[model samples]
Target chain A: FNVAHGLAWSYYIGYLRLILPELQARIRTYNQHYGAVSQRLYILLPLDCGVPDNLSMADPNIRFLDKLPQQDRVYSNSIYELLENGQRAGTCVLEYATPLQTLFAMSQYSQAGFSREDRLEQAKLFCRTLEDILADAPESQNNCRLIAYQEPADDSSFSLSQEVLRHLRQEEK
Target chain B: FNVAHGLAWSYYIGYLRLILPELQARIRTYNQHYGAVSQRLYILLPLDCGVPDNLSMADPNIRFLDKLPQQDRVYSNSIYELLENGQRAGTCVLEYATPLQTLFAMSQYSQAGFSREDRLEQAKLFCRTLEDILADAPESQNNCRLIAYQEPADDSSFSLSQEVLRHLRQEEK
Candidate 1:
């Protein structure tokens, strides 16, 4: 692969730590209202790599395979629109691929250069994919949705208005 | 006062928990998406109590007071209708009350009663209350929304899907 292998290996392992639990807790809560998620997960990943042919495959469904190697040669045409908007990363659902098959396909994506504009298109593409499935959802108690795992983000914090109220109390005291 | 004291206190706490922070968090999230919070907060509450005199106050705009408490007795004549497709409560922009003032007005809803019938109406009424605000929201960088914290419900067992997945995985293994 192109990028240092150990670093990339740790990158996957480390990021999975944050995402895996969040994925579990998120779906648990979503179940109360949306209930019974059965959709296959499709995570959109952006690579900051030097692959130009990769640009043509930027469509999430087409590109996930470029990141890793020894993947099959497949082109998913209609599924191309799922990853084109502006967000760090995004996800969509796929009914066709199993997790192991998806891993097989992703072997090439070293597993990936993504420009911000490139990912923005990816983001827009993702929204439609999710929305279309939502539109197609039958009015049944059952619902299907995508669950995604990603590395992590910088930890930033913000204050609550209640804290501001505490500020007022601080002034009063 | 007009609604009696201890009876009102129970309403104050019982329904209050069912509602309050759901109100605070909801508006706070709108602050994140819509950016900064500047609108009046309106929450719809339902009552099954017996108070024929209160029907006149059905319009959340014709809110049930004002000068904070004495200012707005004079209010909504359609909001009432929106509540009628039989919901127990409704809210929209009313020139009338501040949020704490909203609590003051709702205090009188204590004598409320009617179960399954009133529960559905309350849901619709509150549902409309939510829609009106989203409808009125000023356009911004993102959007505004409410985060509801419904205390709890039947065990749901909560997670049958996880069980099915685990069970199926074992069978395959």
Candidate 2:
């Protein structure tokens, strides 16, 4: 990863942690009053190799991997729309790829042609607005998974070593 | 309080902390799927005199007093049943009184006339079983109430000087 990109990702993670509590409160109240929520919120972290064995010992925040086999290639995609004043302020997508390791990626865009700098600034305002609705609610943080994963391939079905070579061969064709 | 009673309460509190995560998980899933739970889980805490202002600043575990007025004398009661293998293992009631000081009290009863010592040991088992259901859940801990105060009198309801004198006058009568 480039130095600039690493800093940018770090900034985004800090932003997520700052606003997580408020988002959690909103989702909790919504879940309590209106059944399971329609919107999904997730934070994904790759584990050190040989860490996971079963879902029982996993942290609540990181429980999304409970069902997926420990040793498998995987892909995941997610979209987040940042809304302000009942209108779209920006959007971002998260993508993750894994076999022995996972790559977590986020791409951001805005209606007003916002730069990466602008997106970070605007997201803070957007998150504060998001928290306002839940200002009166209690701290209702739960280790709940708002996102679900698609089925992953079995070990025999996909090989990272073969897949990389195959992709290069196809590109040559 | 007697040493035995202090030890008993300490044991109960420790028991609560041990099972809190599991209880939160069960109640959380219930809240997500069904709605605001029918069975309320509370963390009773002792309050300083004239301290509570609003519930927003209070932790979720301690949010029970958010709605009730600041100046009213109040009492609360709760019952809990412990079951094992489709059979009743034990029962307990929590009692709280309020004006300023509160007394959080718990009374445990058993089918076989269990001893106080036996009841503590059995309750630990019962709570551990309670946690087993939520074993797969996440960090569910919050700064909830865990202590209750002794009873308090309403404003203009009783003065210590007047009440003490009145008691003596009543004895003469």
Candidate 3:
């Protein structure tokens, strides 16, 4: 953690930097044998350097399915000023739908008007997923939120549609 | 651990594979600033891909001092059978001495008679060090040991002196 000038990916993904040739041959055989019984998990992470297809070039078992058949493609322009030292720059924006979310979205699409209760249900599921990842995080309120909003008009100058409405200020606890 | 075909080194040494250029510059100056008061810990690990001299080429802070000034260097020739798969070959042999062993060895070098009780004390300190590394390993009875031993004379047969006398066997729990 003390090293200031370096990067880190996942440890499990980068475990193999040194392998003797003798043991290298066995890996191909084992991967092939295990692939038969494996159930596929398609995880989509915006990782910089990705593993080969199937998690290995030899015989890929893992798959990444990112493209959605139906959904409005969200777009935005981001401008972040780089500090002279650049010690701080990173955030995680996740896009994944659990069964609770999928079931809830179906009602919103079919209904004539968006329901407040349905949106609350969606927020509950979102918070549940967040809890799974960060169990120790302070209990967050206002789970259900509208992240996308249009710019408030100011004499009709410098206006951009669909601005991401996040409270950018830090909350000192 | 399930990774079959890959290799692993110490995790702390490999943590810096993903630093951005902005923060990369901060590291050089910090290392230079802190190195003045740093007491060197010259840990001699047999790592495959080593760090640069002083531990970093860009104003390194860590220094590795491996060359011993006064001691007869031990040498040995080893040949082991390679399995077809080769998943089953590895052992850790550490060469380090605590002050207890160092002070005791001084007496042995000067005294004409080698003391058995002093050797037991050497074993006690060795066991203490081993406990630090593998705390959960079954209470090992023998602490002090001569890893290198000369082979007994064979009558007109294949013979090698200074064979490592470790009982290479599985102790089933």
C-alpha lDDT (0 to 100) for residue A8 of candidate 1: 18
| Selected candidate, larger TM-score, 2 vs 3 | 2
Q: Which lDDT tens digits does candidate 1 get at residues A19-102?
A: 333343444443444314222223332222222322343233222311111111122311111222342222222222121121
Model 1 residue A165 CA deviation (Å) reads 47
Q: How many Å off is the CA of A128 in candidate 3?
A: 62
Write the residue-wise lDDT of candidate 2 on B1-173 in tens digits. 12122122222322343444455455445445531322233432233222233312222211121121111113222333333335443322222212111111112222112244443343333334323422422333441222323235353332222322232234335
Model 2 compared with the native: what TM-score?
0.18
lDDT of 1 at A160: 21
Q: Per-residue alpha-carbon lDDT of model 1 for B1-173, expressed as tens digits?
A: 11121112222222332333344445455445531332233332232222232334433323322111101012131111123224423332222111222222233233221123343343333344434434433331122223222222563432212322232234335
Q: By summed lDDT, which 10 consecutive residues of candidate 3 chain B come out lowest?
A: B1-10
Off by over 4 Å in 3: A1-173, B1-104, B108-117, B136-173
Give the proportion of true interface contacts each model preserves, from 0 to 1.
0.00, 0.00, 0.00
RMSD of each: 26.0, 23.7, 25.9
Model 2 chain B — which ten-residue stretch has the worst lDDT? B97-106
